[PDB]
Amino acid sequence: DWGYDDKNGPEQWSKLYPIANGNNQSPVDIKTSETKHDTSLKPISVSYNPATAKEIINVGHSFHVNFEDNDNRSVLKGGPFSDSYRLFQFHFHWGSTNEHGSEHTVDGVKYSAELHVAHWNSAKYSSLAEAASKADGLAVIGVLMKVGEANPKLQKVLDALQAIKTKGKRAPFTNFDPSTLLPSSLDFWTYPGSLTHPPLYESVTWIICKESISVSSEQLAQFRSLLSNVEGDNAVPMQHNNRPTQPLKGRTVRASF
Ligand SMILES: Cc1ccc(C)c(NC(=O)Nc2cc(S(N)(=O)=O)ccc2O)c1
Ligand SMILES: [Zn+2]
């Protein structure tokens, strides 16, 4: 059992998960003076089918929007990949206040939230369960979210939260293309990393967008409005779910720009 509280939070994660102190841990601080431009990086190509949208689930520490991943209807290609990767999920991370909330930071700057759009290597592997722990198994697009104007594209997601207010609650969530949440420029950083929460597998090639997306202070309050408790128990709001940044351990962050 793990979380983002005092006793079960990021600090204690190595007790159950020793890879927490590994050499390919996420998230990281992207230092733009220390990044290395790479001319071999292809553009990011996302092509999602809105019909693959499936379900929204309250997982206690966060909420997930899951996607049907039986075929290649919704794929990521390009960037640093020769393989095609299949969309399975998106979710968010946020903080207790507007001051923090993102997982990744750029030149020490914390943003208010972060969108993760996650994919698995369907070219090399047969399932998410198989891919999830492979070095080249996962591809996650990270988009930093800056507090400002209300993001209208965020609407269908925020509206759906009313149906999944407490832990374990789930509801159908259909006909949504999550590339509509992505910024207009897909200029990016890329580095070898991990899942940002248990089980923390070093299976993720991160794609971090240069361009942020907006979110209002009230849209953030909707995230924090979700409850970590089961129905009938007294309310425990999901205040924050971001992991602190991790030492790069000689890894190199590549820029596409
Ligand atoms: C037990 C187990 C096995 C396999 C996976 C994928 C998980 N992961 C999750 O529950 N969430 C998650 C976190 C990230 S993130 N925050 O690192 O971008 C990306 C994709 C996600 O699915 C857990
Ligand atoms: Zn995440």
Q: How was this structure determined?
A: X-ray
Q: Which residues lie with the beta carbon below 6 Å from any ligand 1 atom?
A: 89, 116, 118, 132, 140, 195-197, 199
Cβ 78 vs Cβ 44: under 8 Å: yes
Could you tell me the CA-to-CA distances from 162 to 2, 52, 136, 230, 232 in Å, in that order? 25, 22, 36, 14, 16
Hey, whose CA ends up nearest to atom 23 of ligand 1? Answer: 199
Name the resolution in angstroms. 2.0
Question: 61 catalytic, yes or no?
Answer: yes
Tally of domains within the chain: 1
Range of the domain at 185: 1-257
Name the CA radius of gyration of the chain, rounded: 17
CA atoms of 160 and 90, how far apart (whole Å) = 14
Beta bridge partners of 64: 57, 91
CA atoms of 167 and 62, how far apart (whole Å) = 9
* Catalytic member of 37, 61, 119, 240: 61
Hey, whose CA ends up nearest to atom 12 of ligand 1? Answer: 195
CA atoms of 41 and 210, how far apart (whole Å) = 15
37 is in an annotated binding site: no
For tokens 């409005």, what's the residue?
225
Helix (H, G, I), strand (E, B) or coil at 10: helix
Q: Which of 195, 196, 245, 246 to mutate to test the pocket of ligand 1 (most atoms within 8 A of CB)?
A: 195
List Cβ<8 Å contacts ≥24 apart for 29-33: 29/104, 29/105, 29/106, 29/107, 29/108, 29/245, 29/248, 30/104, 30/105, 30/106, 30/107, 30/189, 30/208, 30/253, 31/107, 31/253, 32/106, 32/107, 32/255
> Of 208, 240, 245, whose CA–CA distance to 223 is shortest?
240
CA atoms of 74 and 89, how far apart (whole Å) = 11
Q: How many whole angstroms from its chain centre is CA 110?
A: 15
**CATH number reported for the structural domain that contains residue 68 in this entry:** 3.10.200.10
- What percent helix, strand, coil does the chain show, rounded to 5? 15, 30, 55
For tokens 């207009």, what's the residue?
184
104 is in an annotated binding site: no
Q: How many whole angstroms from its chain centre is CA 131?
A: 17
CA atoms of 167 and 57, how far apart (whole Å) = 8
Residue 79, token pair as written in the block: 């960037």
> Of 223, 229, 257, whose CA–CA distance to 242 is shortest?
223
Residue 158 is inside which H or E element, if any? helix 155-160
CA atoms of 71 and 79, how far apart (whole Å) = 21
Could you tell me the CA-to-CA distances from 30 to 11, 27, 135, 233 in Å, in that order? 22, 9, 21, 40
For β-strands 53-58 and 29-30, DSSP reports them as: unpaired
CA atoms of 75 and 98, how far apart (whole Å) = 32
Could you tell me the CA-to-CA distances from 79 to 46, 169, 180 in Å, in that order? 10, 36, 19
CA of 195 to the centre of ligand 1 (A): 6
Hey, whose CA ends up nearest to atom 4 of ligand 1? Answer: 132
